[PDB]
Amino acid sequence: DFAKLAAAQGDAIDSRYHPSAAVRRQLNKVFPTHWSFLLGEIALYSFIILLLTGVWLTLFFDPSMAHVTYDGVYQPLRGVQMSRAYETALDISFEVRGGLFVRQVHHWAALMFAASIMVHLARIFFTGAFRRPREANWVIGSLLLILAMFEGFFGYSLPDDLLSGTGIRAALSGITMGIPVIGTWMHWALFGGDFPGEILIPRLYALHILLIPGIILALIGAHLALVWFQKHTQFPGPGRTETNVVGVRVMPVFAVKSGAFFAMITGVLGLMGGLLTINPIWNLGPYKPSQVSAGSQPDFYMMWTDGLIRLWPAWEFYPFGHTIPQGVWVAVGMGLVFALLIAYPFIEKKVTGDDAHHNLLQRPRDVPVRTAIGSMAIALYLLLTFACMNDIIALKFHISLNATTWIGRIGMVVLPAIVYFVAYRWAISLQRSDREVLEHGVETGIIKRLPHGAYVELHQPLGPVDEHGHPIPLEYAGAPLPKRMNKLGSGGAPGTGSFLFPDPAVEHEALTEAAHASEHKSLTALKEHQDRIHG
Amino acid sequence: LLSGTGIRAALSGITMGIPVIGTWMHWALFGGDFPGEILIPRLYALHILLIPG
Amino acid sequence: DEKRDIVAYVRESAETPSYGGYGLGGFGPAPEGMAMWIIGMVAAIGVAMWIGSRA
Amino acid sequence: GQPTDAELAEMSREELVKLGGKIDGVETIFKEPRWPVPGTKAEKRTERLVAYWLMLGGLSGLALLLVFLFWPWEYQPFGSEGEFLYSLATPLYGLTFGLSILSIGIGAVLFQKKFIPEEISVQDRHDGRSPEVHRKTVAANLTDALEGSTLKRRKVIGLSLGIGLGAFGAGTLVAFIGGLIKNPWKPVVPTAEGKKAVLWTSGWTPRFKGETIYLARATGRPGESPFVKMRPEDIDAGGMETVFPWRESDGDGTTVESEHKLTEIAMGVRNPVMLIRIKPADMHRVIKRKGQESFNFGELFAYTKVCSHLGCPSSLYEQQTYRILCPCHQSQFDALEFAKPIFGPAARALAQLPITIDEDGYLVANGDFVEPVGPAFWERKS
Amino acid sequence: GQPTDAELAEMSREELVKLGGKIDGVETIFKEPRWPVPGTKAEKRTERLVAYWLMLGGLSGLALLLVFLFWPWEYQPFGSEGEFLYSLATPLYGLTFGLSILSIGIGAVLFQKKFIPEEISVQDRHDGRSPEVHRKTVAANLTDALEGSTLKRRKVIGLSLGIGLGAFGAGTLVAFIGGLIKNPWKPVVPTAEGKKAVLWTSGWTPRFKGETIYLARATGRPGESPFVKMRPEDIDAGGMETVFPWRESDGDGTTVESEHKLTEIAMGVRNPVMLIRIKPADMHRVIKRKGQESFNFGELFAYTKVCSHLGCPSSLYEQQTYRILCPCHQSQFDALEFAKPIFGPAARALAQLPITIDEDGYLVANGDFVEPVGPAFWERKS
Ligand SMILES: CC(C)=CCC/C(C)=C/CC/C(C)=C/CC/C(C)=C/CC/C(C)=C/CC/C(C)=C/CC/C(C)=C/CC/C(C)=C/CC/C(C)=C/CC1=C(C)C(=O)c2ccccc2C1=O
């Protein structure tokens, strides 16, 4: 009697505790059903998969520089001195059943985590979800992005590899020693000595499996709690206002679709871990200061920092008996990048004057200057990433390596400007298109007038039509406009039988008019609620 | 010496004496025989992240 | 002898199948990041567009 | 406007759901089932579709189980029967797992989009500026806690608590971080000129005056005799060889005392050097640095491999251009001239090792680098 | 019974605190200040007392800082000038830190107990069985979510989702745990009788038929020649020596190839053995096990050190009692008889190594243990 068991368990729960009101509030919480609001969930799900795979990895990983000869199964690396970290990474790859798959899905989850964090940041920035109520949310999310970047750095640096080791040597060691007053001291504190200090990988292992994941988990908890209680913002729409949330309740629909989305994201990541090879360390010999490779790139989320290193033009200053190497330039650049990213909402409000409580998102077209600035920043980030990749770009796409370096150097001040101008004008022209639709109706096929030979596109008005043909223009309300009669009530009733065979006409008619009734009922309910809010 | 002797007693002997799956649990935990080269890394994971979490 | 060993390694690395799926060229970070951003992120975003709504 | 003391008994499920929405500020508008018409076969087809997706997920999960338990996993040497099975083993694990969970997710999404009823529930958002009753009551509670405590009236306690907390925090933070803090300039590495700091000294620093440091070539032999003495004739015009600072005392790796000295030589960050043979025809284009004019032994030039910018090895030697390129950040150093950077982030030249030949003709270092060899840092160029 | 729309403006702090308590179900009774009478000098003394405690905390925190920054820390070898300072270095760190924070805590407690007003606030506890409105509305919401979803009507979906989730969970759990699951009885250790399991084989198992396994004494020499061949004359009546299975191939630890075989010998769980010289007077009290009657060489008996119960070494030896005691759980084995347990948790006798002397008189195992030597397990005694 599962129904009786459920009832008895509910009564016992509500007697021991009293979660009825709280649970009802959680279940009844309404979440907007916009697709772009799942971008953060992608990052959350990738993070969960990262935790689950990282536990498995830690069950088999040994962090240490203790030198050992492999003497494993992988023949191409036998008798070669390597760190125990590399040896156990190879053991995960080969000796452990499914260890290669687990580590590959872990790395793919890391890449998807960074990518989805970037996409979510783009969504919120361009939609203006950081304004008065949620600047703190933006700030903690920026800290979260920085932590994710650096944890991925430490994660692919954990198995001491040739690629990851040379990346560490460059970024960490060089840029740390570069810092003027405390650079060498920071280097010695972090590595416990010179660069190959025998505590580096244990320290990174701790930072990567316990410390940084703990901070990220706490910050994700704060992030999700803030989103939960500062009810999720929404785009302007029929019944959507600054003081309501139009969407679906948590329990019946949102919970089911979020769980299913998590399942599908897990499936995508597992499929990638299977079919796509990620970081094949066995091809990469154990780290040695002398051995190198041509590629020498970090993961894509640090590729922009590496590209900054490459592109910045070797400007070194030599104060009285001292040196200020080119690494400090990039250190300051990264500092500026993070500072501006964290402080943008406050910069935005200082610049514009907006101190209003904003609960309705802005369309990126509707906010041109911010959209232009975001496009400019994305262009700069892409230029830096492809500058880091300039080695492989030059190799495959036959471009001189010097040519790619200087393309990056010039474009990091030219391409941002071009993209800013283009994005600003593009946003304004999207606004112009929206107003054209508002004032003339949707466009359709052309018709030749009866008496004379005029051609008229035979538009379709979206609002009340004047006594004559031309309609009364509507007022823009911040919501997208249907520019195709495709997406309106036109040409949308295929035979509802099946792909290969029809259904009885009675069934088809019943279904089609039932759907018509349901959709017009939804439209009428939204219209009535909209009229009720002010009217 | 002290703590490794304690491990050898409890974790190894008790685990490996269990009738149906004792040796299997011992080998799964230690990656092999008692002094298996993964015991302390596994305990480190368990002790800094997994169990404290 | 050393040159023969290098030749053997070159041939082995050239003819060795990529363990753990399609080997995206041989360059790790750049092909892997591109494959993420295309395959994984287009899949995720398209699935999000399917599940959610446009408005 | 009443809590429905006894009407809940006869209130139906729909009425109770509406009441809950009302209490929570949620008004459910157009909660309509997906299949109002009963008995239609389109409903059965959609049912079968979601069932097929869930069953595909289950079959793929069973496939994951079966392939994981029974498949030719385990590394297979090159060109051996079973290599193909091993190569597509992990792909099969990932394919089965991902397909299973993806199909389950697709089935769940289809159930939500086809069977779970459609709603446009609208929740009243009470964001911002809690009602004045709550605000003023919280303010009163906090202010009463602060003032009643009699703080901001015991000046001595106010200052003493601040001093105590500040001193304790200072002591605790300093004791937390002093374990990590180390002096980079503590003289530790022994040298002919007494113990010196690590950054100044590399494997090429003479431990005692007049020590012989051979430019030993690092044969890839796994462990035994990894470094072997070197002769100028071994290199030929337009050739580069990575050499290391090997000492007679640092004999082959057969012993345990050795194979730690050799490991230290191999792992020395500032140890590896590139010995390049400048072509005799191109020897006339060489421009030499101050104090490094006699460093080259005839047409042999020894430059540190560590890039002068962030310290990656600069191994990519290009002959017929005499350019030592670094792969980490694409910086070229003109080997013909003193190895000065002529492109890329680097701004300082690579340190040039003084080389010569000892008795028996083996290549040895004729001294130490006249400058620190790794990447630059604050305490440099003086 | 009204929310005080505009009364809050003139409501005082006490009234607002009472209102908040009322809203939260909290009635603050007897919230009285500690010092109603003003100007008294007992108040000043108490103020100064809490101030003194906080100032002691601050002074001790500064002491922690100064001691940590400037104290002769670092190990001092032994009987060395500075050894006394080092010995109380860490105690001083702990003393200063603990005293500082303890004094801060004492000051805070005294401030709470002497200055913060005393209250006996009583909160209304609404525990158990949320009001029927909430219970029934939650039940209605959950039941509407379940039934409206149309589940428990699509038997094919109900069963398919269960099958899919179960299969996926099975596959995922098996894939998670199969990396760990290893077969204890995979024949890996080579032996004269082919590869055998690790539990069956020890360091005393002859790798090839007729192999010589000397009972090498483990000298404490740090690294070089750790194991040295042994002779019967070395022990004297009532003597115990810990010996290991040393092979001629496992030469001294000078080489890298050696010092790994030797490390394996030292770290072998079942390798160490105790060689006991039974006193000739007491040799007549010896009882011998089935198949172990000729194992002893004259008055030499070689018993495994690993205790038969949980595998700790049984290193303690009592002569004139001939009792091999295990420190882990106080089990005694009668060495005179076959090393059968005559006390403690152990129930199986220690395995007896056959021993003899080869040419030159060096002690060598005359075979292998006729039983598994470590602690017992399921697959044993057959
Ligand atoms: C710092 C910086 C950006 C310097 C400039 C270097 C650079 C990126 C130059 C452009 C590269 C191109 C497009 C070369 C083709 C020749 C060329 C320049 C033609 C004119 C360009 C032009 C305006 C054309 C008009 C039409 C048009 C837009 C054509 C674009 C054609 C292309 C290539 C579109 C895709 C863009 C693309 C993928 C560029 C390469 C970027 C990267 C990082 C690829 C990474 C990558 C590599 C490198 C693999 O080898 C690989 C192997 C196996 C699996 C995966 C991969 C993989 O993902």
Ligand SMILES: CC(C)=CCC/C(C)=C/CC/C(C)=C/CC/C(C)=C/CC/C(C)=C\CC/C(C)=C/CC/C(C)=C/CC/C(C)=C/CC/C(C)=C/CC1=C(C)C(=O)c2ccccc2C1=O
């Ligand atoms: C970026 C932004 C919105 C900034 C707001 C303005 C602001 C506050 C600026 C202050 C900070 C500064 C100084 C910024 C300038 C430069 C900058 C952004 C530095 C920080 C870099 C950083 C930590 C985060 C930026 C992340 C971000 C928003 C990236 C763009 C993400 C978006 C919208 C992607 C499009 C969605 C989509 C379908 C992507 C997949 C399709 C493809 C292939 C897109 C192109 C593409 C991309 C996008 C890659 O990332 C990539 C990485 C590695 C190899 C290849 C590729 C590649 O081909």
Ligand SMILES: CC(C)=CCC/C(C)=C\CC/C(C)=C/CC/C(C)=C/CC/C(C)=C/CC/C(C)=C/CC/C(C)=C/CC/C(C)=C/CC/C(C)=C\CC1=C(C)C(=O)c2ccccc2C1=O
């Ligand atoms: C060889 C080998 C070892 C292979 C294995 C690889 C490995 C090591 C690890 C991965 C293996 C595993 C365990 C994979 C499965 C992972 C997993 C649990 C998937 C669940 C997805 C699934 C099976 C769905 C079935 C379809 C279905 C009926 C769905 C509806 C019921 C379900 C499952 C609902 C789940 C809801 C869900 C995702 C809850 C997440 C809980 C968390 C952390 C946060 C909740 C939460 C969410 C989700 C928000 O979106 C949100 C947005 C704004 C503000 C706040 C929140 C918020 O608090």
Ligand SMILES: CCCCCCCCCCCCCCCC(=O)O[C@H](COC(=O)CCCCCCC[C@@H](C)CCCCCCCCC)COP(=O)(O)O[C@H]1[C@H](O)[C@H](O)[C@H](O)[C@@H](O)[C@@H]1O
């Ligand atoms: C959900 C995940 C779905 C992922 C799809 C997975 C794809 C499966 C691929 C096939 C099965 C696995 C193959 C494993 C074995 C294997 O590795 O595959 C090579 C082939 O490789 C190639 O050429 C490329 C062939 C082109 C088809 C594959 C392209 C798929 C890309 C597009 C997927 C990533 C997305 C990137 C988007 C990019 C656009 C950005 C806008 C084949 O040998 P070969 O061809 O000879 O490789 C040479 C050595 O020999 C030789 O030494 C060596 O030196 C080389 O020359 C080497 O090429």
Ligand SMILES: CCCCCCCCCCCCCCCC(=O)O[C@H](COC(=O)CCCCCCC[C@@H](C)CCCCCCCCC)COP(=O)(O)O[C@H]1[C@H](O)[C@H](O)[C@H](O)[C@@H](O)[C@@H]1O
């Ligand atoms: C407000 C606090 C004011 C005090 C600031 C103290 C920092 C200045 C140091 C002053 C004394 C320096 C000379 C005497 C000492 C000396 O000679 O040592 C030196 C290195 O100074 C040390 O000792 C440890 C430094 C202590 C950590 C300082 C942390 C920074 C402070 C400023 C931040 C916290 C303060 C609160 C403000 C923030 C509030 C938050 C809002 C060199 O090391 P070395 O010769 O190699 O020996 C190594 C042994 O030291 C080493 O502990 C050991 O680990 C070994 O590794 C060994 O190598």
Ligand code: HEM
């Ligand atoms: C939170 C975000 C995380 C990110 C972005 C991340 C990223 C990464 C990446 C990219 C790798 C390289 C994997 C490879 O090269 O095969 C890695 C390795 C590793 N990760 Fe993480 N990780 C995260 C969380 C965790 C957690 C929570 C744990 C522990 C529970 C963990 C444990 C490990 C271990 C042990 C390794 C080394 C395994 C190996 O070398 O193959 N990671 N990480």
Ligand code: FES
């Ligand atoms: S690391 Fe060599 S030029 Fe930058």
Ligand code: FES
């Ligand atoms: S361990 Fe020896 S008696 Fe228990």
